[PDB]
Amino acid sequence: GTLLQPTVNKFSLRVFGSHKAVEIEQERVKSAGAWIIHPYSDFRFYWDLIMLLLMVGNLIVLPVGITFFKEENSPPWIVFNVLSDTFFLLDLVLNFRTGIVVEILLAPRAIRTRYLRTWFLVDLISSIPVDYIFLVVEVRFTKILSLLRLLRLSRLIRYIHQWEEIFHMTYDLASAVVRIFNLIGMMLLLCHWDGCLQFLVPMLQDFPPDCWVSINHMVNHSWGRQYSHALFKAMSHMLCIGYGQQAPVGMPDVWLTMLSMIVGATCYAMFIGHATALIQSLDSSRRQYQEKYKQVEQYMSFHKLPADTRQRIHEYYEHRYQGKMFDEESILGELSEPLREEIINFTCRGLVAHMPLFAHADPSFVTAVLTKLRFEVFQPGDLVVREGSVGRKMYFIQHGLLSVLRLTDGSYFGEICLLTRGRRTASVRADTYCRLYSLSVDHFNAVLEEFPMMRRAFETVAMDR
Amino acid sequence: GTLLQPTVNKFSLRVFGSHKAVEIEQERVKSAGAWIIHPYSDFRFYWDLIMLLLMVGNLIVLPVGITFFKEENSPPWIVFNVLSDTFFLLDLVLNFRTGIVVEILLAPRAIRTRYLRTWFLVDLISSIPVDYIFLVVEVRFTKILSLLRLLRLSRLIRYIHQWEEIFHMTYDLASAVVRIFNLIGMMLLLCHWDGCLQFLVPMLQDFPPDCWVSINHMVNHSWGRQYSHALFKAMSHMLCIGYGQQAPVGMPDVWLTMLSMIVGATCYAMFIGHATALIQSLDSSRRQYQEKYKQVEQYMSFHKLPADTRQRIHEYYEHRYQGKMFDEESILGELSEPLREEIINFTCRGLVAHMPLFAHADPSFVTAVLTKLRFEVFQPGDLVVREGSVGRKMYFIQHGLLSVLRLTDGSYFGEICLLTRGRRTASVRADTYCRLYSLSVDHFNAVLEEFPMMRRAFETVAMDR
Amino acid sequence: GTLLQPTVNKFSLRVFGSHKAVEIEQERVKSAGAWIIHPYSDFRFYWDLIMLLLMVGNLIVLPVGITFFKEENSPPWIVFNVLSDTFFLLDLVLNFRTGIVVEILLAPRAIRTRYLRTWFLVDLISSIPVDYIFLVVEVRFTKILSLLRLLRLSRLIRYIHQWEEIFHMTYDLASAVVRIFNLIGMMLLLCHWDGCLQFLVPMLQDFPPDCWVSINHMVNHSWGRQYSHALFKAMSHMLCIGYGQQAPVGMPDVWLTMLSMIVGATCYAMFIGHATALIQSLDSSRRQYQEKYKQVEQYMSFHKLPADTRQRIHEYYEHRYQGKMFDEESILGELSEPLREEIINFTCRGLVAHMPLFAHADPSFVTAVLTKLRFEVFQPGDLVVREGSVGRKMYFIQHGLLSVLRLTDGSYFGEICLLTRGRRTASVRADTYCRLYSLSVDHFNAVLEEFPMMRRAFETVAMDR
Amino acid sequence: GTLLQPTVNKFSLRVFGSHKAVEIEQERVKSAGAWIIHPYSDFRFYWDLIMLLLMVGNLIVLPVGITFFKEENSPPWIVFNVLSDTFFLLDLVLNFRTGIVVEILLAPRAIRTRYLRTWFLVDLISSIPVDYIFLVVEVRFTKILSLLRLLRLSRLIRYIHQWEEIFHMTYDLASAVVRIFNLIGMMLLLCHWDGCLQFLVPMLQDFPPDCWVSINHMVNHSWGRQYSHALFKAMSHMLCIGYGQQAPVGMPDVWLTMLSMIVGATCYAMFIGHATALIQSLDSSRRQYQEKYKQVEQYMSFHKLPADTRQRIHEYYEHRYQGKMFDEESILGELSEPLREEIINFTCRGLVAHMPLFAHADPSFVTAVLTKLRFEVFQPGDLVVREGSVGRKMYFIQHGLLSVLRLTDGSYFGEICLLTRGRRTASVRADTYCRLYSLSVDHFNAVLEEFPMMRRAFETVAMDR
Ligand SMILES: CC[C@H](C)[C@H](CCC[C@H]1CC[C@H]2C[C@@H](OC(=O)CCC(=O)O)CC[C@]2(C)C1)[C@H](C)CCCC(C)C
Ligand SMILES: CC[C@H](C)[C@H](CCC[C@H]1CC[C@H]2C[C@@H](OC(=O)CCC(=O)O)CC[C@]2(C)C1)[C@H](C)CCCC(C)C
Ligand SMILES: CC[C@H](C)[C@H](CCC[C@H]1CC[C@H]2C[C@@H](OC(=O)CCC(=O)O)CC[C@]2(C)C1)[C@H](C)CCCC(C)C
Ligand SMILES: CC[C@H](C)[C@H](CCC[C@H]1CC[C@H]2C[C@@H](OC(=O)CCC(=O)O)CC[C@]2(C)C1)[C@H](C)CCCC(C)C
């Protein structure tokens, strides 16, 4: 009873909402008629799996059995076509009930009319055994009518695109890979049908003496050898190679060769387009860094900077972004509030634990300080703090080595200047590339204004010193 | 009388302005000479439709009648060329009056000189019956002069581009589809003319014994069979296949084969370029999400985050953007003032109606509150509100489930903390992925400052509690 | 005397600065040695023009005279090679003086060493008559040494790239067109040299009985027919066609055919890449609008908006951006101060002249008001001003039609509300798509604070009403 | 002893941190077992260099020795295969110790299981001499088993990608060039193996009378001639040319020809994709300027500006950005504090030294003024300062010429207006394109508030004047 209703999985929770959001859709399926199928249920998924396997089997086997074999009266050929057309006739009946994702679940007002207006005629032609009707009522004209079963490609293309739009939502998949697999699966099928058609056309003309089958003397070999030579001819026309020694003499050979060349040329052009779209999406973060550095060196060339400054800015961007493009401010802006706190507790927590003033504080005070740190990268030779300055910023050390006028990683300098609000006494020069965390004086005074209990403690520090 | 003036349709209102803006253009057409055509009128549209149908008919039929048939004295061939060249001679006369969109409507100062300086000579050559003049004054040399009618391609290319620049403004069309249809329509016509030229060249030489027509023994067949073999040869040269058993022996066969190969190669290269430009524009919102997540995981790799935090940020972006790239702030910034209010009345109106304090308010007060809500997404396990905090924000619940230390969809929590301005007492943990609407305390105090009548009501609440 | 110094043209003013900036470079050329050429002067331009014409002539004519003709002792062939190698030997001497744009003008320290370290050996080999030396000292081995003159392609590629980097600065040119013309000019030259090589290889072997020349029986025809057949063979190998009836039998035919196929395949791949890069840059402003609307409809699909709101936002973006992407704020930010004032005096000046209060003002007061107008687009059905509101904004009408609860273009409404600072009395509904200019109350109060003389005038208005 | 530990070079400092960060990794290698190799050490680099040279040698030589020579019992062929398979067996043993960069250094828990689960079976098959075992236990069936040595391509692809991900971090390399060199190196190897396979297949069938070897009569020639003809056949199938006079008759010739055509077609499509991705990254800063100017002229076309204003804005953008796209504000934002000061000391220091008031100041005062200058570009004809204005900004002159109502480069005007805070007396018109540095009055008053010692000096100026 509940197999026709949408179950609660990851896809239904992502496409509807909570569990209560899925219960409303289940009640909506209940508010429809007697037995109405929902297109996200498990019954429709199992049925579409069975039908997709049958469509692949029929669209591979049916041209080969028609074109390369003797008669349509052999006993495995009749049982295979009658039992398959029964299942494709049940797929016509069950499409009156499923409803169309635009969802539509009301019956029979919108489903039946929206199905009759769009896809009923093609499914009706590809469902019924048309050739057996003309055979019972009334021989080589029935082999043309048996190719109406190849209109089951239209409901194959519909049923593949219904699953992929689901499975882009359930999983994380690249769209280029899915689309190029769809293109490869179409190209193989068109080459197979063209290989069957190359031998189908001279067979209806009782093998004229100018066709390739009578020239190469392969009228009475096995069907495998005939299929191999016909597929070689169709693939050499498809990939635009050049076949044979003489130009085609008969009139249906010329036009069908030209049709094969046009279809192969446009399929190969679409394959090149998909391969280019796949290759351009591989190295995006490497490419955007290159474009950004092109703009940087263009800014250098506009103001006519010297060569040493150009080299120095290049070394700075190499040690800053590392050939890798990102923008930390927008990434920290997009995240939520518990996710920003978790990243800072990995990077900035351990350096503040070295400082004796912040170690004894409450954790409600420390986390407000940790959000206002800023990441800075320096060079060997750069003077970090200069003498005679106001000293507004306090620095923590993550990596690198620097000297006061040696301080290794995990240290700190300029701490007492933010408390005394006076002139800096010493000067600091970086010995190598340093990674620092900076705290300004106003960003600390705001947090002192947020907590008056910690404000009393730093007043007792200032009275002692 | 008013057929020469621009009528008032969607295109004229979009390209000029209001109805009064179109009346000024109609008065400008009236201020011109005796009978002056405006290029956006209905007369020019109907005339260009008739002329485009004639150009397609002549550029298809005229090479086939010249190259594959016997004489130019048959009675349907004379009537078809005299009645068509009369219409192409009227198109030369009416171009003195229409005026050129750069508009120009003044006559005959700018129109006549700007037409004589650009396109008069080509239209004059492609208009007049040049071969009949040389035939009356004075035979196989007239078949070369009859191909001057193929310069009607130049005014075909002009008349197609005049409609498409209109119909990009009237309707919403993709530019890649229009441009690739123009390329396909050009490629078919060049292949048709090359198919006629392959048989035209040996005919003027009275079929030498080394040409392909005398080798394949098809001098005296029908014109359909000759056209099919000539088009097969031209298409195999065009798609770069390889033709025949021997290399071409005669000198006009070699150079014209080389010209066909060069023209086909450059047309196929432009087709691959257009197919790539069409494929790259299909999945843009899917691709920009992938580039953004490449930058996100690069930001992860720079600071060397642990694996569980990487997985958690990935799950957050999956449940936030859903594989789909957009930026809500700029989209809400671009819209107008009545359009922003209509979107909020669909999403944020129903949740505020649950709250008993905002239900009895005036609608002028509620809509100022509704603009300042912010959309937030949380995770299972994240603590939404923590104990011991100031509690500046009030939260409404759209989806998801959470627990106080169960609250389903449509609920709210933290409401009394914004009124009391005190410390939060309880803690809230989200059981699953929640979608919340947040209102800060300052964004509500601004709206309380906007309306002093509602400020009195919340004072009566604070005195009772 | 002044022909060796850089003259004052548009390029020199763009690459140096003012006239005084060019005088310093002229004095720098004067501070060099006795006769030193500057690479931006007129002498170097005229000399490079003469040399580029000679290089095109020699690189076209020299393979054909060697491979297809009888002897190198004919009197026009000796005079043409002696007088040309004199000019290519003067180009070796004058490269010791010109100096290299990295500029370098100091002689002979940097110029001579930087020339000897890079390009002296190739120019020395391509300059001197090597084969005549071996002919005087000591026959078919001299035809191989005469192809050392084809190393003049290396200084051709240098002299073309020196002009294009100049002429991208003098004029505005698309880079894709220049680069694809360079590629086409290289491809034609490689096909020409391969056409000469196809006949050069069997000639040194005294025409073996297995080569294509002895099979097709063309040993004793004219040089034009031999060149046409050899170029057809090289082009069919170049465009990957397929030649002849039998596979090549001799060993130098196989490897040189394979070299031709590899060179043609990589040149055709680079041509497809350049054609794609050219096609992608044609419709950029059309494509960015499509990407922006993809993000808009994705924002619609995320919050699950109804269909009528989707249609309404689509109509708004059609009447706002018109299928055309731009961002007015950044464009107005990039411009200078006199350019922003000129655009506003075209668009916003005529509407403010209708208002009687702003007509009698000083022009210093009006232009400060005109910078703070904002462009707004409304829809039919939207209520512009509602009753019971504060009325902070005053609106001017450019296009469209609206009704008070009819006001055509050029009108205004809501003017008295900004002066009285009271509640709006009437309501305005737009009948069609309107284009309005908005002025807020604070943006007008700032300009009233800027000018106290106009502040007295609006006080006399408020006392009368 | 220290050869197995990661040394301190530029790559290790970039991938770990400081010297103390590398010492922790060396202690981590010490904390592992008896002899454990670190994958960034020098031993693994030298070993991978030796193994990559051996893999290139074996994958080139091994098909040619099997397919084109007589027997596998010749004495150089046995010594070359036994001594090479010893080295490929040592590479199997040393992969139990190196540890996998995901790093992993713990043994044998994670290394051995993570190696057995992924790549042990392929390396085991490609390591051992399988054919000699079947030869000792028990002839043409051993030539098929000897091609198991061609599974050494799998550890070649692994060892190339391990170096390139290192050498993208050590040096600055474009990713497109590296990836297209990998593709070319793969394509040459596949064409070589296909050339060996074309002759391998008829040899196992004892040269049937229908194969190409017996048709072209080359059974008993040398191995070089057979290799040249086989490679020509495989390359003509690979580049999709068309081979021979007749279609292939035998069944293994048809299917292997079809496999060659499919492999060549997909490799050529990937080559076109890589060439397009390489060409699109050459002219990025030229292309972004073109896209920006497309948006500019679209903003012009939306508001229907006159032609002279369009020309004037075009001339402004030509003299502003010079066909070259950059954004100075974000570039100055990304840099550090000592790098911003170094650029200003090149450009803005020399112009301020002309002014007599700023020459006698302290250098701590001047550098705070220099950060607040703004770069401006004017046109000929634009009025820079107008009479009757407040005069908030002071201007310095870098280039260009202008007149007061002549001032060359290096001058200044409007200096006294910022000190007097009064109305400007004169008007300035630019004679040509000027480049100016602007200082506002509030940006100077902030620096006067920063330094009270300089504030006393400008008070003594104001009392004298
Ligand atoms: C991957 C392509 C999927 C093939 C689609 C169907 C199953 C998809 C899945 C099947 C297995 C999955 C395993 C998944 O790994 C996880 O599930 C995460 C970790 C975990 O929870 O175990 C990653 C990709 C996924 C490969 C993709 C495919 C686009 C549809 C083709 C089916 C039909 C239309 C011919
Ligand atoms: C679509 C391409 C249009 C073909 C152009 C001419 C009619 C255009 C129209 C004709 C029918 C339209 C129906 C339209 O649908 C609506 O009109 C919106 C709903 C409604 O109001 O009904 C969408 C696309 C439109 C397909 C496009 C085309 C670019 C020009 C080619 C004509 C000539 C140069 C050979
Ligand atoms: C256009 C390509 C130019 C061909 C280059 C040399 C002259 C350039 C000029 C020659 C004529 C120009 C006319 C110019 O129009 C104007 O000058 C603006 C209006 C005016 O002032 O008249 C636009 C493009 C310009 C076409 C381009 C080209 C890139 C270099 C090739 C020369 C050599 C390396 C083979
Ligand atoms: C360049 C490609 C490098 C070839 C890689 C290996 C050495 C790399 C180096 C070797 C020489 C370098 C010289 C370097 O120039 C400098 O070192 C800066 C100035 C200086 O310090 O001297 C620029 C590029 C570098 C060319 C690149 C390449 C991607 C790996 C291929 C090796 C193996 C996988 C087949």
Q: For position D262, which CATH number holds?
A: 1.10.287
State the burial class of residue D160 (Cβ atoms within 10 Å of its Cβ: 0-12, 13-18, 19+): middle
With the C-alpha atoms ordered A14, A16, A17, A21, is the resulting torsion angle positive or negative?
negative
Query: Which chain A residues have a beta carbon less than 8 Å from that of D21?
Result: 399, 409
Q: How far apart are CA B243 and CA A261, in angstroms?
A: 14
Rg (CA), chain B: 37
Rg (CA), chain C: 37
With the C-alpha atoms ordered C269, C271, C272, C274, is the resulting torsion angle positive or negative?
positive
Q: How many residues does chain B have?
A: 465
Domains in chain B, number: 4
Q: Give the 3-state secondary structure of residue A403.
A: strand
Q: Are B124 and B92 in contact (CB under 8 A)?
A: yes
Q: How far apart are CA C58 and CA C75, in angstroms?
A: 17
Joined tokens for residue D191 = 């064409």
Answer yes or no: is A180 within a domain: no
Beta bridge partners of residue D374, listed in sequence order: D438
Task: Say which CATH number the domain at A382 has.
Answer: 2.60.120.10
Residue pairs spanning B and C at CB distance below 8 A: 141
Q: Are C259 and C265 in contact (CB under 8 A)?
A: no
Of C242, C245, C276, the CB nearest to A242: C242
Given A271, A298, A326, the domain boundary residue is A326
- E strand or H helix at D326: none
Secondary structure percentages of chain A, helix, strand, coil, to 5: 65, 5, 30
Q: How far apart are CA D327 and CA D292, in angstroms?
A: 12
Instruction: Check whether the bond before A108 is cis (ω within 30° of 0).
Output: yes
Of A168, A172, A324, the CB nearest to B302: A324
Q: Are C379 and C429 in contact (CB under 8 A)?
A: no
Between the two ends of chain B, the Cα-to-Cα distance in Å is: 81
Query: Which chain A residues have a beta carbon less than 8 Å from that of B275?
Result: 269-270, 272-273
B424 is in an annotated binding site: yes
Whether residues B245 and D242 touch (CB distance < 8 A) is answered with no
Answer yes or no: is A188 within a domain: no
What separation in Å is there between the alpha carbon of B44 and the centre of ligand 2? Answer: 19
Whether residues D242 and B242 touch (CB distance < 8 A) is answered with yes
Residues D124 and D3 in one domain: yes
- Give the list of residues 6+ apart from residue A439 with CB closer than 8 angstroms, or none: A369, A372, A373, A374, A393, A394, A395, A396, A418
Joined tokens for residue C462 = 């408020």
Residue nearest to atom 18 of ligand 4 (CA): D171
Ligand 1 pocket member A164 (CB < 6 A) = yes
Q: Are C366 and C428 in contact (CB under 8 A)?
A: no
| Breaks (C–N over 2.5 Å) after residues, chain B | 102, 138, 405
Scan for tokens 């060039």, then name that residue.
D177
Scan for tokens 């602007």, then name that residue.
D438
Q: How far apart are CA A158 and CA C372, in angstroms?
A: 55
C425 is in an annotated binding site: yes
Q: How far apart are CA C178 and CA C68, in angstroms?
A: 34
List Cα–Cα distances, A36 to A1, A31, A117, A388, in angstroms: 11, 10, 20, 82
Q: DSSP for B361-419, please give it.
A: S-HHHHHHHHTT-EEEE--TT-EEE-TTS----EEEEEE--EEE--B-TT-EESHHHHH
Query: Nearest C-alpha of chain C: how many angstroms from A302?
Result: 10
Scan for tokens 């294509």, then name that residue.
C212
Q: How far apart are CA A260 and CA A254, in angstroms?
A: 10
Q: How far apart are CA A120 and CA A95, in angstroms?
A: 9
Answer yes or no: is A222 within a domain: no
Joined tokens for residue D433 = 């394109």
Scan for tokens 């049937």, then name that residue.
D208
Across A197-290, where does the E strand assignment appear?
none
A152 DSSP 8-state letter: G
Q: What are phi and psi of D402, to 5 degrees?
A: -150, 165
Q: What are phi and psi of A434, to 5 degrees?
A: -110, 150
Whether residues C247 and D229 touch (CB distance < 8 A) is answered with yes
Q: How far apart are CA D223 and CA C448, in angstroms?
A: 97
Q: Are A428 and A404 in contact (CB under 8 A)?
A: yes
Q: How far apart are CA D6 and CA D25, in angstroms?
A: 8
Whether residues A272 and D277 touch (CB distance < 8 A) is answered with no
Joined tokens for residue B318 = 């999956």
Joined tokens for residue A275 = 């391969």
Following CA atoms D276, D277, D280, D281 in sequence, which dihedral angle do they give, to the nearest 10 degrees? Answer: -150
Given C137, C172, C207, the domain boundary residue is C172
Query: Nearest C-alpha of chain D: how many angstroms from A66?
Result: 23
Alpha carbon of residue A354 to chain centroid: 45
Q: How far apart are CA C454 and CA C367, in angstroms?
A: 13
Q: How far apart are CA B305 and CA B171, in angstroms?
A: 50
D128 DSSP 8-state letter: S
Joined tokens for residue B192 = 């048709």
Q: How far apart are CA C263 and CA C255, in angstroms?
A: 12
Joined tokens for residue B62 = 């005229």
Residues C199 and C321 in one domain: no
Of B250, B215, C354, D284, nearest in space to A295 by CA: D284
Q: How far apart are CA D121 and CA C245, in angstroms?
A: 48
H-type alpha helices, D171-283: 175-204, 212-215, 223-238, 251-279
Residues D130 and D207 in one domain: no
The CB density around residue C100, as the number of other CB atoms within 10 Å, is 15
Residues B402 and B300 in one domain: no
With the C-alpha atoms ordered A218, A224, A230, A232, is the resulting torsion angle positive or negative?
negative
Scan for tokens 């350096």, then name that residue.
A351
Answer yes or no: is B375 within a domain: yes
Residues A299 and A411 in one domain: no
Q: Are C362 and C454 in contact (CB under 8 A)?
A: yes
Answer yes or no: is C22 within a domain: yes
Ligand 1 pocket member A178 (CB < 6 A) = yes
Q: How far apart are CA A71 and CA A203, in angstroms?
A: 13
- Give the list of residues 6+ apart from residue D40 with CB closer than 8 angstroms, or none: D6, D11, D12, D15, D166
Q: How far apart are CA A69 and CA C287, in angstroms?
A: 53
Residues B210 and B80 in one domain: no
How many CA atoms lie within 13 Å of B319's alpha carbon, on the beta-carbon side? 24
Joined tokens for residue C360 = 């009698």
Q: Are D89 and D125 in contact (CB under 8 A)?
A: no
List Cα–Cα distances, B130 to A218, B74, B88, B136, in angstroms: 57, 18, 13, 10
Q: Could you tell me whether strands B402-404 and C374-377 are parallel, antiparallel, or unpaired per DSSP bridges? A: unpaired
Answer yes or no: is B331 within a domain: no
List Cα–Cα distances, C49 to C80, C156, C163, C178, C422, in angstroms: 19, 11, 10, 18, 77
The CB density around residue B379, as the number of other CB atoms within 10 Å, is 17
Query: Which chain D residues have a beta carbon less than 8 Å from that of A271?
Result: 269
Q: How far apart are CA A225 and CA A229, in angstroms?
A: 6
Residues A297 and A394 in one domain: no
Q: How far apart are CA A233 and CA A237, in angstroms?
A: 6
List Cα–Cα distances, C317 to C399, C409, D7, in angstroms: 17, 22, 60
Of A19, A21, A258, the CB nearest to B232: A258
Residues A318 and A396 in one domain: no
Ligand number nearest to the C-alpha of A159: 1
Q: How many residues does chain D have?
A: 465
Scan for tokens 């009607």, then name that residue.
B152
A4 DSSP 8-state letter: S
Beta bridge partners of residue A375, listed in sequence order: A437
Q: How far apart are CA A217 and CA C419, in angstroms?
A: 101
Q: How far apart are CA D324 and CA D283, in angstroms?
A: 10
Residues D322 and D246 in one domain: no
Q: How far apart are CA C376 and CA C393, in angstroms?
A: 12
Its domain, for residue A428, covers: 336-464
Q: How far apart are CA D447 and CA A360, in angstroms?
A: 39
C450 is in an annotated binding site: no
Residues B155 and B275 in one domain: no
Q: How far apart are CA A451 and CA A364, in angstroms?
A: 9
Ligand 1 pocket member A167 (CB < 6 A) = yes
Query: Nearest C-alpha of chain C: how many angstroms from B73?
Result: 39
- Give the list of residues 6+ apart from residue B20 with CB closer than 8 angstroms, or none: C408, C409
B196 is in an annotated binding site: no
What separation in Å is there between the alpha carbon of A319 and the centre of ligand 4? Answer: 18
Q: What are phi and psi of C128, to 5 degrees?
A: -75, 150
Ligand 3 pocket member C207 (CB < 6 A) = no
A343 DSSP 8-state letter: H
Resolution (A): 2.7
Given C172, C201, C223, the domain boundary residue is C172
Residues D436 and D371 in one domain: yes
Residues D57 and D147 in one domain: yes
Amino acid type, D5: Q
The CB density around residue B41, as the number of other CB atoms within 10 Å, is 20
Q: How far apart are CA C199 and CA A147, in angstroms?
A: 54
State the burial class of residue B340 (Cβ atoms within 10 Å of its Cβ: 0-12, 13-18, 19+): middle
Q: How far apart are CA D382 and CA C209, in angstroms?
A: 81
Instruction: Check whether the bond before D108 is cis (ω within 30° of 0).
Output: yes
* Structure-determination approach: cryo-EM
Q: Give the 3-state secondary structure of residue D48.
A: helix
Scan for tokens 């992993």, then name that residue.
D104
Joined tokens for residue C73 = 């002792």
